[PDB]
Amino acid sequence: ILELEAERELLNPPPSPLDKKFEQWEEQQAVEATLAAMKARRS
Amino acid sequence: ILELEAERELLNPPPSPLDKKFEQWEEQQAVEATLAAMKARRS
Amino acid sequence: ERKYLELKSQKNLYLARLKSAIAAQKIEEIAGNLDNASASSLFERIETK
Amino acid sequence: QEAPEDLLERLLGEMELELIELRRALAQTIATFKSTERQRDAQQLIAQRWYEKAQAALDRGNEQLAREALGQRQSYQSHTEALGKSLGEQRALVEQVRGQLQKLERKYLELKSQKNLYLARLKSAIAAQKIEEIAGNLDNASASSLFERIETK
Amino acid sequence: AALDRGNEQLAREALGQRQSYQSHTEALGKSLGEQRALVEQVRGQLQKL
Amino acid sequence: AALDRGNEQLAREALGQRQSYQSHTEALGKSLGEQRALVEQVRGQLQKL
């Protein structure tokens, strides 16, 4: 029945490598792009 | 039931390192920034 | 003696996970309510009708 | 056919006794883990105590005392090591199911919020159903058009 | 103020946290924007009804 | 007067304490400012009522 909880993990988008890599890389995109945003306005 | 009091500690923002570090560093920011405030007006 | 104290300690941890398993089993009942929410989607459609 | 609408209210009402059980059930997972944490804190303490024994054991040229004192600490540090490994193992599982319970909580609040919005639309649907009754009165208005014609007769 | 005094990580984490909350804030706005049309619609219906 | 005569710590602590009380004072002002609008509003209602 705990393995059935995992069936819910796959039912929802599971942590697939590219998705999480994309989400991870997206976080890099979000943080890196935002990193310059604040650094520029204060200048 | 004392461990359930701790469940209240986590329910509220617990003393997470960065939060308390930020709050601690914020105290340094507050004290250090204010430190010069009084030192300047009396001059 | 060392076996029993570890046996009893793990049992409580074992049951602790079992209680967590029940929650994993109980979240299925509300997922069953999500089926009632699907049955709510059933009369969401009659609502849409 | 029991109105399945009442099931939505009745069924979701049971979750109150349900997720709290997970809220209470997971608590044990934490009590055991931190209870183990203190036990390791005691195991490292006595293992540290053994170092205190081995700390002065060698002093004044007493090699055997430190050799035995350390050989004893390693056995206790093995106990201390085991607890840390078990505690480190627990750290991930407690952080995981707790993350689950967090999401298992997010679903209900959104589930209950949408239910009320869902029923809110349902009440709007009843009005759409009730405007049909007056449209049924428009049929009586057509039947009024029926004796509007006899009125015209 | 996270970045102030040369503390980059605090702002990086602080913003990464805001995006998660802004995602919650974004979701509510999208839901609210969705509701805006439906409330304006059925209200227009009730006006005609 | 904490800083007077070269006593830095007293002022540092004294201010760190005031900020906590000013936080209490700040909170009341924010609550009071919040109340200002609501009291002015319902009072305007009661005027119209």
TrEMBL record, chain D:
Q: Does the keyword Translocase apply?
A: no
* Annotated residues for binding of ADP 2: 23, 137, 139, 142, 144
- Which positions are annotated as binding ADP 1? 23, 112, 139-140
Superkingdom of the organism of origin: Bacteria
> Where do the coiled-coil regions begin and end?
87-153
- The residues listed in the UniProt record as binding ADP 4, with positions renumbered to this chain, are 139-140, 142, 144
Any idea which positions bind ADP 5?
137, 140, 142
Positions of ADP 3 binding: 23, 139-140, 144
- Would you tell me the protein name for this molecule? Chloroplast membrane-associated 30 kD protein
What are the top taxonomic ranks of the organism? Answer: Bacteria, Bacillati, Cyanobacteriota, Cyanophyceae, Synechococcales
